[PDB]
Amino acid sequence: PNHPLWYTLCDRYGLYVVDEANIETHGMVPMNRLTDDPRWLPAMSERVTRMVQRDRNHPSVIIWSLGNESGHGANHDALYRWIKSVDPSRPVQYEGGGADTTATDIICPMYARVDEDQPFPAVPKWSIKKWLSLPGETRPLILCEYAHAMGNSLGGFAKYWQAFRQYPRLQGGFVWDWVDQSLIKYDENGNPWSAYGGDFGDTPNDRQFCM
Amino acid sequence: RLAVMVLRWSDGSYLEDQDMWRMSGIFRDVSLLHKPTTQISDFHVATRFNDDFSRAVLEAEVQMCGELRDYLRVTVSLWQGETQVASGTAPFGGEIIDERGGYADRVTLRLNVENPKLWSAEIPNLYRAVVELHTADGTLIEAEACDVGFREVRIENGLLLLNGKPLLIRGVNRHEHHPLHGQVMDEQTMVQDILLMKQNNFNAVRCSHY
Numbered sequence A: 001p002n003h004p005l006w007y008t009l010c011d012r013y014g015l016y017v018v019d020e021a022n023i024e025t026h027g028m029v030p031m032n033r034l035t036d037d038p039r040w041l042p043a044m045s046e047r048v049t050r051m052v053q054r055d056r057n058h059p060s061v062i063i064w065s066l067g068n069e070s071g072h073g074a075n076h077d078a079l080y081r082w083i084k085s086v087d088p089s090r091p092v093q094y095e096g097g098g099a100d101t102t103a104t105d106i107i108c109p110m111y112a113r114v115d116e117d118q119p120f121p122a123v124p125k126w127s128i129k130k131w132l133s134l135p136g137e138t139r140p141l142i143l144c145e146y147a148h149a150m151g152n153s154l155g156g157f158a159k160y161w162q163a164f165r166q167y168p169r170l171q172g173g174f175v176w177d178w179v180d181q182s183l184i185k186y187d188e189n190g191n192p193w194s195a196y197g198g199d200f201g202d203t204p205n206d207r208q209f210c211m
Numbered sequence B: 001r002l003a004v005m006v007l008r009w010s011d012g013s014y015l016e017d018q019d020m021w022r023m024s025g026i027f028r029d030v031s032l033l034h035k036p037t038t039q040i041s042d043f044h045v046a047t048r049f050n051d052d053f054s055r056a057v058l059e060a061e062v063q064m065c066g067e068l069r070d071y072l073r074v075t076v077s078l079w080q081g082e083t084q085v086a087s088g089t090a091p092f093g094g095e096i097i098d099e100r101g102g103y104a105d106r107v108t109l110r111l112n113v114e115n116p117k118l119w120s121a122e123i124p125n126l127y128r129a130v131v132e133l134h135t136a137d138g139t140l141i142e143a144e145a146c147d148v149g150f151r152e153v154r155i156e157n158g159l160l161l162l163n164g165k166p167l168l169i170r171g172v173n174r175h176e177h178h179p180l181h182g183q184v185m186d187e188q189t190m191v192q193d194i195l196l197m198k199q200n201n202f203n204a205v206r207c208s209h210y
Protein backbone atom coordinates (compact mmCIF):
# COMPACT_ATOMS: atom_id res chain seq x y z
CA PRO A 1 0.00 0.00 0.00
CA ASN A 2 1.19 3.49 -0.89
CA HIS A 3 1.42 6.79 0.98
CA PRO A 4 -2.24 7.72 1.68
CA LEU A 5 -1.98 10.89 -0.42
CA TRP A 6 -1.34 8.87 -3.60
CA TYR A 7 -4.91 7.56 -3.66
CA THR A 8 -6.28 11.09 -3.11
CA LEU A 9 -4.27 12.35 -6.07
CA CYS A 10 -5.41 9.40 -8.26
CA ASP A 11 -9.06 10.11 -7.27
CA ARG A 12 -8.71 13.76 -8.32
CA TYR A 13 -6.49 13.46 -11.38
CA GLY A 14 -8.13 10.27 -12.65
CA LEU A 15 -6.03 7.09 -12.70
CA TYR A 16 -7.16 3.50 -12.06
CA VAL A 17 -5.37 1.88 -9.16
CA VAL A 18 -4.53 -1.69 -8.23
CA ASP A 19 -3.99 -1.55 -4.46
CA GLU A 20 -1.69 -4.37 -3.40
CA ALA A 21 -1.02 -6.03 -0.03
CA ASN A 22 2.49 -5.80 1.43
CA ILE A 23 3.21 -9.49 0.84
CA GLU A 24 6.14 -10.81 -1.18
CA THR A 25 8.01 -13.97 -0.20
CA HIS A 26 9.86 -14.38 -3.49
CA GLY A 27 13.04 -15.72 -1.86
CA MET A 28 11.40 -18.76 -0.22
CA VAL A 29 11.93 -22.29 -1.59
CA PRO A 30 9.44 -23.15 -2.89
CA MET A 31 7.86 -19.69 -3.29
CA ASN A 32 4.66 -20.65 -1.40
CA ARG A 33 6.42 -22.13 1.65
CA LEU A 34 5.01 -19.46 4.00
CA THR A 35 1.79 -18.70 2.08
CA ASP A 36 0.66 -22.36 2.27
CA ASP A 37 1.48 -22.49 6.01
CA PRO A 38 -1.51 -21.82 8.34
CA ARG A 39 0.91 -20.47 10.96
CA TRP A 40 1.57 -17.48 8.67
CA LEU A 41 -2.13 -16.78 7.92
CA PRO A 42 -2.59 -14.29 10.79
CA ALA A 43 0.39 -12.22 9.63
CA MET A 44 -0.73 -12.31 5.97
CA SER A 45 -4.37 -11.57 6.76
CA GLU A 46 -3.46 -8.33 8.56
CA ARG A 47 -1.55 -7.09 5.53
CA VAL A 48 -4.65 -7.73 3.41
CA THR A 49 -7.46 -6.72 5.80
CA ARG A 50 -5.86 -3.53 7.16
CA MET A 51 -5.25 -2.36 3.57
CA VAL A 52 -8.90 -2.88 2.59
CA GLN A 53 -10.06 -1.12 5.77
CA ARG A 54 -7.90 1.91 4.98
CA ASP A 55 -8.41 2.24 1.23
CA ARG A 56 -11.93 0.94 0.45
CA ASN A 57 -13.50 4.40 0.07
CA HIS A 58 -11.14 5.55 -2.72
CA PRO A 59 -12.82 5.44 -6.14
CA SER A 60 -9.43 5.24 -7.92
CA VAL A 61 -8.85 1.80 -6.38
CA ILE A 62 -10.64 -0.48 -8.81
CA ILE A 63 -8.83 -3.77 -8.06
CA TRP A 64 -7.43 -5.42 -4.94
CA SER A 65 -4.20 -7.44 -5.19
CA LEU A 66 -3.12 -10.12 -2.69
CA GLY A 67 0.55 -9.25 -3.05
CA ASN A 68 3.29 -10.35 -5.38
CA GLU A 69 5.41 -13.41 -6.05
CA SER A 70 4.58 -15.62 -3.08
CA GLY A 71 3.59 -18.74 -4.97
CA HIS A 72 0.00 -19.80 -4.42
CA GLY A 73 -0.91 -21.13 -1.00
CA ALA A 74 -4.15 -21.93 0.78
CA ASN A 75 -3.74 -18.65 2.74
CA HIS A 76 -4.18 -16.75 -0.54
CA ASP A 77 -7.49 -18.57 -1.19
CA ALA A 78 -8.75 -17.72 2.29
CA LEU A 79 -7.89 -14.01 1.89
CA TYR A 80 -9.26 -13.93 -1.68
CA ARG A 81 -12.59 -15.02 -0.20
CA TRP A 82 -12.36 -12.60 2.74
CA ILE A 83 -12.12 -9.63 0.32
CA LYS A 84 -14.90 -10.95 -1.99
CA SER A 85 -17.19 -11.23 1.00
CA VAL A 86 -16.27 -7.88 2.65
CA ASP A 87 -16.12 -5.80 -0.55
CA PRO A 88 -18.06 -7.14 -3.58
CA SER A 89 -17.49 -3.87 -5.43
CA ARG A 90 -13.97 -4.69 -6.70
CA PRO A 91 -12.35 -7.66 -8.48
CA VAL A 92 -9.49 -9.45 -6.75
CA GLN A 93 -6.31 -10.34 -8.62
CA TYR A 94 -3.15 -12.25 -7.77
CA GLU A 95 -0.35 -13.55 -10.02
CA GLY A 96 1.48 -16.13 -7.86
CA GLY A 97 1.24 -19.83 -8.70
CA GLY A 98 0.83 -19.37 -12.43
CA ALA A 99 -1.33 -16.25 -12.93
CA ASP A 100 -4.63 -18.15 -13.24
CA THR A 101 -5.26 -19.79 -9.83
CA THR A 102 -8.56 -19.89 -7.91
CA ALA A 103 -7.27 -16.82 -6.01
CA THR A 104 -7.64 -14.41 -8.97
CA ASP A 105 -10.59 -12.92 -10.92
CA ILE A 106 -8.22 -11.78 -13.64
CA ILE A 107 -5.56 -13.75 -15.50
CA CYS A 108 -2.63 -11.54 -14.70
CA PRO A 109 0.66 -13.02 -15.92
CA MET A 110 4.04 -11.38 -15.79
CA TYR A 111 6.05 -11.24 -19.06
CA ALA A 112 3.79 -13.63 -20.96
CA ARG A 113 4.57 -13.09 -24.63
CA VAL A 114 2.07 -12.23 -27.32
CA ASP A 115 2.50 -15.25 -29.64
CA GLU A 116 5.26 -17.40 -28.10
CA ASP A 117 4.56 -19.92 -25.31
CA GLN A 118 7.00 -20.38 -22.43
CA PRO A 119 5.89 -23.74 -21.05
CA PHE A 120 7.66 -23.80 -17.68
CA PRO A 121 6.56 -26.84 -15.62
CA ALA A 122 3.78 -26.12 -13.08
CA VAL A 123 3.71 -22.36 -13.88
CA PRO A 124 3.71 -22.05 -17.72
CA LYS A 125 3.51 -18.56 -19.34
CA TRP A 126 1.31 -19.17 -22.35
CA SER A 127 1.10 -16.81 -25.23
CA ILE A 128 -1.59 -14.38 -24.01
CA LYS A 129 -3.82 -15.05 -27.03
CA LYS A 130 -3.62 -18.77 -26.35
CA TRP A 131 -4.16 -18.34 -22.57
CA LEU A 132 -7.63 -16.80 -23.13
CA SER A 133 -8.95 -19.82 -25.02
CA LEU A 134 -7.56 -22.65 -22.87
CA PRO A 135 -10.38 -25.17 -22.32
CA GLY A 136 -12.64 -23.85 -19.54
CA GLU A 137 -11.06 -20.38 -19.35
CA THR A 138 -13.44 -17.40 -19.29
CA ARG A 139 -11.64 -14.60 -17.41
CA PRO A 140 -10.13 -11.41 -18.79
CA LEU A 141 -6.37 -11.13 -19.02
CA ILE A 142 -4.42 -8.07 -17.92
CA LEU A 143 -0.67 -8.43 -17.48
CA CYS A 144 0.43 -7.28 -13.99
CA GLU A 145 3.91 -6.82 -15.50
CA TYR A 146 5.04 -6.79 -19.15
CA ALA A 147 7.44 -4.98 -21.51
CA HIS A 148 10.39 -4.95 -19.05
CA ALA A 149 11.85 -1.45 -19.58
CA MET A 150 15.41 -2.19 -18.32
CA GLY A 151 17.92 0.02 -20.14
CA ASN A 152 17.61 0.12 -23.92
CA SER A 153 14.34 -1.78 -24.09
CA LEU A 154 10.60 -1.88 -25.04
CA GLY A 155 11.27 -3.66 -28.33
CA GLY A 156 8.08 -5.33 -29.56
CA PHE A 157 5.82 -3.05 -27.50
CA ALA A 158 3.57 -2.42 -30.55
CA LYS A 159 2.97 -6.16 -30.73
CA TYR A 160 1.27 -6.11 -27.32
CA TRP A 161 -0.87 -3.18 -28.37
CA GLN A 162 -1.97 -4.73 -31.64
CA ALA A 163 -3.12 -7.80 -29.64
CA PHE A 164 -4.80 -5.75 -26.87
CA ARG A 165 -6.84 -3.94 -29.55
CA GLN A 166 -7.80 -7.04 -31.52
CA TYR A 167 -8.88 -9.30 -28.61
CA PRO A 168 -11.75 -8.17 -26.40
CA ARG A 169 -10.53 -10.20 -23.39
CA LEU A 170 -6.94 -8.91 -23.63
CA GLN A 171 -7.58 -5.75 -21.63
CA GLY A 172 -4.02 -4.48 -21.43
CA GLY A 173 -1.31 -4.44 -18.79
CA PHE A 174 1.10 -2.68 -16.42
CA VAL A 175 4.56 -1.91 -17.80
CA TRP A 176 7.45 -2.79 -15.49
CA ASP A 177 8.08 -0.16 -14.50
CA TRP A 178 7.94 3.59 -13.94
CA VAL A 179 11.12 4.91 -12.37
CA ASP A 180 14.78 3.79 -12.26
CA GLN A 181 15.66 2.88 -8.66
CA SER A 182 19.04 4.65 -8.75
CA LEU A 183 20.51 6.54 -5.79
CA ILE A 184 22.66 9.68 -5.68
CA LYS A 185 26.30 9.33 -4.56
CA TYR A 186 29.00 12.02 -4.59
CA ASP A 187 32.60 12.16 -5.83
CA GLU A 188 35.59 13.96 -4.19
CA ASN A 189 34.61 17.32 -5.76
CA GLY A 190 30.98 17.00 -4.60
CA ASN A 191 29.52 16.03 -7.99
CA PRO A 192 26.40 13.79 -7.97
CA TRP A 193 26.24 10.48 -9.86
CA SER A 194 23.68 7.69 -10.29
CA ALA A 195 24.48 4.62 -8.21
CA TYR A 196 22.86 1.18 -8.38
CA GLY A 197 23.13 -2.20 -6.58
CA GLY A 198 26.62 -2.86 -5.23
CA ASP A 199 27.88 0.76 -5.15
CA PHE A 200 27.32 1.11 -1.37
CA GLY A 201 29.30 -2.01 -0.37
CA ASP A 202 26.08 -4.05 -0.26
CA THR A 203 26.76 -7.76 -0.86
CA PRO A 204 25.37 -9.98 -2.30
CA ASN A 205 23.75 -7.60 -4.84
CA ASP A 206 22.00 -7.64 -8.24
CA ARG A 207 23.65 -4.59 -9.89
CA GLN A 208 21.66 -2.54 -12.45
CA PHE A 209 18.54 -4.76 -12.13
CA CYS A 210 16.99 -2.12 -9.81
CA MET A 211 16.72 0.19 -12.84
CA ARG B 1 -41.62 -53.58 -66.92
CA LEU B 2 -40.50 -50.61 -64.82
CA ALA B 3 -40.98 -47.12 -66.14
CA VAL B 4 -39.34 -44.12 -64.48
CA MET B 5 -40.03 -40.52 -65.45
CA VAL B 6 -37.01 -38.53 -64.08
CA LEU B 7 -37.39 -34.72 -64.03
CA ARG B 8 -34.24 -32.55 -64.23
CA TRP B 9 -35.81 -29.78 -62.14
CA SER B 10 -38.23 -29.86 -59.19
CA ASP B 11 -39.02 -27.89 -56.02
CA GLY B 12 -36.21 -30.11 -54.64
CA SER B 13 -33.75 -28.20 -56.85
CA TYR B 14 -34.16 -25.17 -54.58
CA LEU B 15 -32.38 -27.14 -51.85
CA GLU B 16 -29.70 -28.53 -54.20
CA ASP B 17 -27.70 -25.43 -55.15
CA GLN B 18 -24.25 -26.90 -54.40
CA ASP B 19 -21.26 -25.46 -56.29
CA MET B 20 -20.80 -28.30 -58.78
CA TRP B 21 -21.92 -29.65 -62.17
CA ARG B 22 -25.70 -29.70 -62.30
CA MET B 23 -26.61 -33.13 -63.76
CA SER B 24 -29.56 -35.59 -63.73
CA GLY B 25 -30.81 -39.17 -64.06
CA ILE B 26 -30.65 -42.48 -62.25
CA PHE B 27 -27.05 -41.97 -61.14
CA ARG B 28 -26.83 -44.50 -58.29
CA ASP B 29 -27.66 -48.21 -57.94
CA VAL B 30 -31.10 -49.73 -58.52
CA SER B 31 -31.98 -52.89 -56.65
CA LEU B 32 -34.71 -55.35 -55.69
CA LEU B 33 -35.01 -56.49 -52.11
CA HIS B 34 -37.10 -59.35 -50.80
CA LYS B 35 -38.07 -59.31 -47.10
CA PRO B 36 -40.38 -61.66 -45.18
CA THR B 37 -43.80 -60.41 -44.04
CA THR B 38 -42.48 -60.62 -40.48
CA GLN B 39 -39.32 -58.53 -40.84
CA ILE B 40 -36.69 -56.46 -39.10
CA SER B 41 -37.74 -52.98 -40.22
CA ASP B 42 -35.16 -50.92 -38.33
CA PHE B 43 -32.23 -51.32 -35.91
CA HIS B 44 -29.92 -48.90 -34.00
CA VAL B 45 -26.53 -49.71 -32.51
CA ALA B 46 -25.05 -47.70 -29.63
CA THR B 47 -21.83 -48.31 -27.73
CA ARG B 48 -21.22 -46.68 -24.34
CA PHE B 49 -18.21 -46.77 -22.08
CA ASN B 50 -16.88 -46.56 -18.56
CA ASP B 51 -14.40 -43.74 -17.70
CA ASP B 52 -11.29 -45.54 -19.05
CA PHE B 53 -12.86 -47.49 -21.95
CA SER B 54 -12.06 -50.88 -20.41
CA ARG B 55 -15.76 -51.83 -20.48
CA ALA B 56 -18.56 -51.25 -22.97
CA VAL B 57 -22.25 -51.94 -23.28
CA LEU B 58 -23.40 -52.51 -26.81
CA GLU B 59 -27.06 -51.51 -27.01
CA ALA B 60 -29.25 -52.54 -29.96
CA GLU B 61 -32.81 -51.39 -30.50
CA VAL B 62 -34.58 -53.59 -33.04
CA GLN B 63 -37.92 -52.78 -34.68
CA MET B 64 -40.18 -55.28 -36.43
CA CYS B 65 -43.07 -55.15 -38.89
CA GLY B 66 -45.75 -57.79 -39.34
CA GLU B 67 -47.85 -59.65 -36.82
CA LEU B 68 -46.78 -59.86 -33.19
CA ARG B 69 -46.30 -63.31 -31.67
CA ASP B 70 -45.15 -64.62 -28.32
CA TYR B 71 -42.73 -67.03 -30.07
CA LEU B 72 -40.81 -64.20 -31.78
CA ARG B 73 -37.26 -63.42 -30.61
CA VAL B 74 -34.30 -61.28 -31.55
CA THR B 75 -30.72 -62.34 -31.04
CA VAL B 76 -27.96 -59.78 -31.42
CA SER B 77 -24.59 -61.48 -31.47
CA LEU B 78 -21.28 -59.69 -31.75
CA TRP B 79 -18.29 -61.14 -33.55
CA GLN B 80 -14.54 -60.52 -33.62
CA GLY B 81 -13.48 -62.43 -36.72
CA GLU B 82 -14.82 -65.97 -36.29
CA THR B 83 -14.93 -65.65 -32.48
CA GLN B 84 -18.31 -64.80 -30.91
CA VAL B 85 -17.60 -62.37 -28.07
CA ALA B 86 -21.13 -61.58 -26.81
CA SER B 87 -24.75 -62.51 -27.41
CA GLY B 88 -28.19 -61.51 -26.27
CA THR B 89 -31.68 -62.85 -26.93
CA ALA B 90 -35.08 -61.49 -26.01
CA PRO B 91 -38.76 -61.42 -26.94
CA PHE B 92 -40.44 -58.33 -28.32
CA GLY B 93 -41.97 -55.67 -26.11
CA GLY B 94 -39.95 -52.72 -24.87
CA GLU B 95 -39.99 -50.96 -21.48
CA ILE B 96 -42.98 -48.83 -20.48
CA ILE B 97 -42.66 -45.40 -22.17
CA ASP B 98 -45.80 -43.46 -21.18
CA GLU B 99 -49.38 -43.89 -19.84
CA ARG B 100 -50.26 -46.08 -22.84
CA GLY B 101 -47.41 -48.60 -22.38
CA GLY B 102 -44.38 -49.28 -24.56
CA TYR B 103 -43.47 -50.52 -28.00
CA ALA B 104 -44.73 -54.07 -28.37
CA ASP B 105 -43.04 -54.09 -31.81
CA ARG B 106 -39.50 -53.24 -30.48
CA VAL B 107 -36.86 -54.78 -28.23
CA THR B 108 -33.53 -53.50 -26.88
CA LEU B 109 -30.63 -55.91 -26.38
CA ARG B 110 -27.70 -55.02 -24.15
CA LEU B 111 -24.39 -56.83 -24.38
CA ASN B 112 -21.39 -56.46 -22.10
CA VAL B 113 -18.00 -56.27 -23.77
CA GLU B 114 -14.83 -56.29 -21.68
CA ASN B 115 -11.69 -54.54 -22.93
CA PRO B 116 -13.27 -53.64 -26.27
CA LYS B 117 -10.97 -53.00 -29.21
CA LEU B 118 -11.64 -49.36 -30.01
CA TRP B 119 -12.28 -47.89 -33.42
CA SER B 120 -10.40 -44.83 -34.65
CA ALA B 121 -9.02 -43.53 -37.98
CA GLU B 122 -5.60 -44.69 -36.67
CA ILE B 123 -6.66 -48.30 -35.90
CA PRO B 124 -10.05 -49.06 -37.46
CA ASN B 125 -11.01 -52.03 -35.20
CA LEU B 126 -14.37 -53.49 -36.20
CA TYR B 127 -16.65 -56.10 -34.79
CA ARG B 128 -19.54 -57.62 -36.71
CA ALA B 129 -23.05 -57.40 -35.22
CA VAL B 130 -25.57 -59.92 -36.52
CA VAL B 131 -29.24 -59.23 -35.80
CA GLU B 132 -31.28 -62.45 -36.08
CA LEU B 133 -35.09 -62.38 -36.10
CA HIS B 134 -36.30 -65.86 -35.20
CA THR B 135 -38.66 -68.14 -33.27
CA ALA B 136 -38.04 -69.16 -29.66
CA ASP B 137 -37.44 -72.72 -30.93
CA GLY B 138 -34.66 -71.50 -33.25
CA THR B 139 -36.01 -71.12 -36.77
CA LEU B 140 -34.47 -68.12 -38.52
CA ILE B 141 -36.87 -65.71 -40.18
CA GLU B 142 -34.20 -63.25 -41.35
CA ALA B 143 -30.87 -61.68 -40.39
CA GLU B 144 -29.43 -58.23 -40.85
CA ALA B 145 -25.97 -57.04 -39.83
CA CYS B 146 -23.52 -54.15 -39.72
CA ASP B 147 -19.93 -53.35 -38.87
CA VAL B 148 -19.51 -52.04 -35.33
CA GLY B 149 -16.80 -49.65 -34.21
CA PHE B 150 -16.53 -49.18 -30.46
CA ARG B 151 -15.91 -45.44 -30.06
CA GLU B 152 -17.25 -42.44 -28.14
CA VAL B 153 -17.53 -38.98 -29.65
CA ARG B 154 -18.20 -36.13 -27.27
CA ILE B 155 -17.51 -32.48 -26.72
CA GLU B 156 -16.16 -31.79 -23.27
CA ASN B 157 -14.77 -28.53 -21.87
CA GLY B 158 -14.65 -27.08 -25.38
CA LEU B 159 -12.73 -30.04 -26.89
CA LEU B 160 -13.97 -32.66 -29.40
CA LEU B 161 -12.88 -36.01 -28.00
CA LEU B 162 -12.69 -39.40 -29.64
CA ASN B 163 -12.40 -42.15 -27.06
CA GLY B 164 -11.42 -39.42 -24.55
CA LYS B 165 -8.58 -37.90 -26.63
CA PRO B 166 -8.69 -34.50 -28.42
CA LEU B 167 -8.84 -35.00 -32.20
CA LEU B 168 -6.77 -33.13 -34.75
CA ILE B 169 -8.77 -33.11 -37.95
CA ARG B 170 -6.63 -33.53 -41.07
CA GLY B 171 -9.64 -33.32 -43.29
CA VAL B 172 -10.61 -32.70 -46.87
CA ASN B 173 -13.95 -31.86 -48.50
CA ARG B 174 -14.83 -34.45 -51.13
CA HIS B 175 -17.53 -34.22 -53.78
CA GLU B 176 -18.63 -37.29 -55.73
CA HIS B 177 -16.99 -36.72 -59.10
CA HIS B 178 -15.54 -38.80 -61.94
CA PRO B 179 -14.25 -37.22 -65.23
CA LEU B 180 -15.87 -39.94 -67.42
CA HIS B 181 -18.99 -40.93 -65.48
CA GLY B 182 -19.86 -37.56 -63.90
CA GLN B 183 -21.46 -38.10 -60.51
CA VAL B 184 -21.69 -41.90 -60.71
CA MET B 185 -19.40 -43.50 -58.14
CA ASP B 186 -17.82 -46.93 -58.12
CA GLU B 187 -15.81 -48.96 -55.61
CA GLN B 188 -12.46 -48.55 -57.43
CA THR B 189 -12.55 -44.72 -57.53
CA MET B 190 -13.70 -44.66 -53.90
CA VAL B 191 -10.87 -46.98 -52.83
CA GLN B 192 -8.39 -44.96 -54.91
CA ASP B 193 -9.50 -41.76 -53.12
CA ILE B 194 -9.26 -43.34 -49.66
CA LEU B 195 -5.74 -44.68 -50.30
CA LEU B 196 -4.51 -41.34 -51.63
CA MET B 197 -6.01 -39.47 -48.66
CA LYS B 198 -4.42 -41.72 -46.06
CA GLN B 199 -1.13 -41.87 -47.99
CA ASN B 200 -1.19 -38.08 -47.77
CA ASN B 201 -1.84 -37.84 -44.03
CA PHE B 202 -5.59 -37.15 -44.12
CA ASN B 203 -7.71 -38.70 -41.37
CA ALA B 204 -11.09 -37.12 -42.09
CA VAL B 205 -13.50 -36.41 -44.92
CA ARG B 206 -16.50 -34.14 -45.24
CA CYS B 207 -19.44 -35.27 -47.41
CA SER B 208 -19.69 -32.01 -49.32
CA HIS B 209 -22.57 -31.40 -49.48
CA TYR B 210 -24.97 -34.35 -49.48
Ligand SMILES: O=C1O[C@H](CO)[C@H](O)[C@H](O)[C@H]1O
Pocket: B018, B019
Ligand atom coordinates in the same frame (compact mmCIF):
# COMPACT_ATOMS: atom_id res chain seq x y z
O1 LIG C 1 -17.72 -21.53 -49.69
C1 LIG C 1 -17.73 -22.21 -50.69
O2 LIG C 1 -16.81 -21.84 -51.77
C2 LIG C 1 -16.19 -22.95 -52.43
C3 LIG C 1 -15.46 -22.39 -53.65
O3 LIG C 1 -14.83 -23.43 -54.42
C4 LIG C 1 -17.24 -23.99 -52.82
O4 LIG C 1 -18.16 -23.40 -53.74
C5 LIG C 1 -18.02 -24.52 -51.62
O5 LIG C 1 -19.04 -25.43 -52.03
C6 LIG C 1 -18.67 -23.39 -50.82
O6 LIG C 1 -19.08 -23.89 -49.54
Ligand SMILES: [Mg+2]
Pocket: B017, B018, B019
Ligand atom coordinates in the same frame (compact mmCIF):
# COMPACT_ATOMS: atom_id res chain seq x y z
MG1 LIG D 1 -22.30 -22.64 -52.38
Ligand code: NA
Pocket: A163, A164, A165, A166, A167, A168, A169, A170, A171, A172
Ligand atom coordinates in the same frame (compact mmCIF):
# COMPACT_ATOMS: atom_id res chain seq x y z
NA1 NA E 1 -8.96 -5.75 -25.71
Ligand code: NA
Pocket: A209, A210, A211
Ligand atom coordinates in the same frame (compact mmCIF):
# COMPACT_ATOMS: atom_id res chain seq x y z
NA1 NA F 1 14.16 -5.11 -11.07
